[PDB]
């Protein structure tokens, strides 16, 4: 069924020096299971179609959650439960209505895959 398990519009952020900086580009976050059965959490630049981030994630490696204190209410973090590693994203879906459902789906497919 389809290619992606989950996809949604979102921008990424990068650490420049010691500063977390939102990347302004229109992006797509997605989860794909490849034929080796591994689960990939990816970010793709929509304009170029380049997949810039592609992380193999195993169950319980990480949690995707809203960053509450951002006035946008649309920043999410993929937090690696072991280590300090965090990847920040910002929802680019025009309506906020599905933000929490997208987040819920990320967690399901990373932490409970088939």
């Amino acid at each position: 069924s389809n290619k992606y398990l989950v996809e949604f519009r979102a921008g990424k952020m990068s650490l420049k020096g010691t500063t977390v900086t939102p990347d302004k580009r229109k992006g797509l976050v997605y989860i794909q299971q490849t034929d080796d059965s591994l689960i990939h959490f990816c970010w793709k630049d929509r304009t170029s179609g380049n997949v810039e981030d592609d992380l193999i994630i195993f169950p319980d490696d990480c949690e995707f959650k809203r960053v509450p204190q951002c006035p946008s209410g649309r920043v999410y973090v993929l937090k690696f439960k072991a280590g300090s590693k965090r990847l920040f994203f910002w929802m680019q879906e025009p309506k906020t209505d599905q933000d929490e459902e997208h987040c819920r789906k990320v967690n399901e497919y990373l932490n409970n895959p088939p």
């Binding site: 439960k81 072991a82 300090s84």
Partner: protein
Amino acid sequence: MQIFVKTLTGKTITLEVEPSDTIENVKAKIQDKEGIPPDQQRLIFAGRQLEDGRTLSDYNIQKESTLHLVLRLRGG
């Protein structure tokens, strides 16, 4: 209530907290007592990574519980 924080070097630190405290607060108490910057702290309880804006009660952490502290600044 007293809780225990076990680090990877076999040191365990005891903290006095309230269930109403946020994870951010806990991290600040650990910085205050052992000097580890909050940005380097990853706190684990019952196989969940604890998030800064939640409280200890959110996770059902009761007196004399042990949290695990992993540092690993950067990310491989």
